[PDB]
Design a protein around this ligand. Structure first.
Ligand SMILES: COc1cc2ncnc(N3CCC[C@@H](c4ccccc4)C3)c2cc1OCCc1ccccn1
Ligand SMILES: [Mg+2]
Ligand SMILES: [Zn+2]
Length: 305
């Protein structure tokens, strides 16, 4: 049962879920309750799903259980401040998608898996980890007593899984660049139509990027510390690249760590600011994400001087 400070602060886009792991499941239950109703999931079925999801996240520095819940929380905040736009089913699916969207991640990029010749890259040639993440989600749903969608009709079940599939695939950031370009064209020609399912999928995709990247929308101390965990995986990957005989990109090369601030500038200019700029144009109540993103861009510019 949620303490008062969290009942309040959880509505803030910049909420941080804290260091107490055992609290995160109740945090997610509360979010899904508040967004989708307490009559919607069988409580002990949902609990069991949640613990099995936790168990199939790995102890990696960043792509871990904490990241998953944090991304779900960003989605909760977007959904709360955009009442009436998304269906019951969409809100259920998106929150579950966010919880599940990095299942069984190793802390390595699709590119590294492809260079390594990992079996997953043979099985899923594109969006490799993201296809696996969705595969893991289904496997967990098929375990005895884990079908949190058991009361929905067959049709609604296939529907919500497809919502989840597309949302998890969309977290492959390689897809974001084209998606966002399409959406910005749509916005500026006044052609964006939320009743159009393909447009709607794009908007959900962008929301999934926004949540996945949300470390850059927290207050600076959180953003800065989260970047330590992000780079710990990047640098581990570049070491691994060095071990296959391949010179890693700078971002993954620990020997170029003094360039981290310049790198952050690059990322904010080319990815984060455009992402939340476009999201605020479509969903104006998401503006606090953009403002916090800009403040962090200013902090990184401060570090450089
Ligand atoms: C919050 O920090 C980041 C989070 C990221 N999350 C997912 N993917 C990334 N990258 C994937 C490959 C390309 C990269 C990118 C794309 C466009 C411009 C810049 C970077 C995005 C990320 C890069 C980040 O900054 C790390 C930024 C960085 C870049 C270079 C050297 C040191 N740090
Ligand atoms: Mg991912
Ligand atoms: Zn993620």
């Amino acid at each position: 049962n949620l303490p008062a400070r969290i009942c309040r602060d959880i509505e803030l886009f910049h909420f941080d879920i804290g260091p107490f792991e055992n609290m995160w499941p109740g945090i997610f239950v509360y979010m899904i309750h508040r967004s989708c109703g307490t009559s919607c999931f069988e409580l002990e079925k949902l609990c069991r799903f949640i613990m099995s999801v936790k168990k199939n996240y790995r102890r990696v520095p960043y792509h871990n259980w904490k990241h998953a819940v944090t991304v779900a929380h960003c989605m909760y905040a977007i959904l709360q401040n955009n009442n009436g736009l998304f269906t019951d089913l969409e809100r259920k699916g998106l929150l579950i998608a966010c919880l599940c969207h990095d299942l069984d991640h190793r802390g390595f990029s699709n590119s590294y898996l492809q260079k390594f010749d990992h079996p997953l890259a043979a099985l899923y040639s594109t969006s490799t980890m993201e296809q696996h993440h969705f595969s893991q989600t289904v496997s967990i749903l098929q375990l005895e007593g884990h079908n949190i969608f058991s009361t929905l009709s067959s049709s609604e079940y296939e529907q919500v899984l497809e919502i989840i599939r597309k949302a998890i695939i969309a977290t492959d950031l390689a897809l974001y660049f084209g998606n966002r370009k399409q959406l910005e064209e749509m916005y500026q020609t006044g052609s964006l139509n939320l009743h159009n399912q393909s447009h709607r999928d794009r908007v959900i995709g962008l929301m999934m990027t926004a949540c996945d990247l949300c470390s850059v929308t927290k207050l600076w101390p959180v953003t800065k510390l989260t970047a330590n965990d992000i780079y710990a995986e990047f640098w581990a990957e570049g070491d691994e690249m060095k071990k296959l005989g391949i010179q890693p990109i700078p971002m993954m090369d620990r020997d170029k760590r003094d360039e981290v601030p310049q790198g952050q500038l690059g990322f904010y200019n080319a990815v984060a600011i455009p992402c939340y700029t476009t999201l605020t144009q479509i969903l104006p109540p998401t503006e606090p994400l953009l403002k916090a993103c800009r403040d962090n861009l200013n902090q990184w510019e401060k570090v450089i001087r």
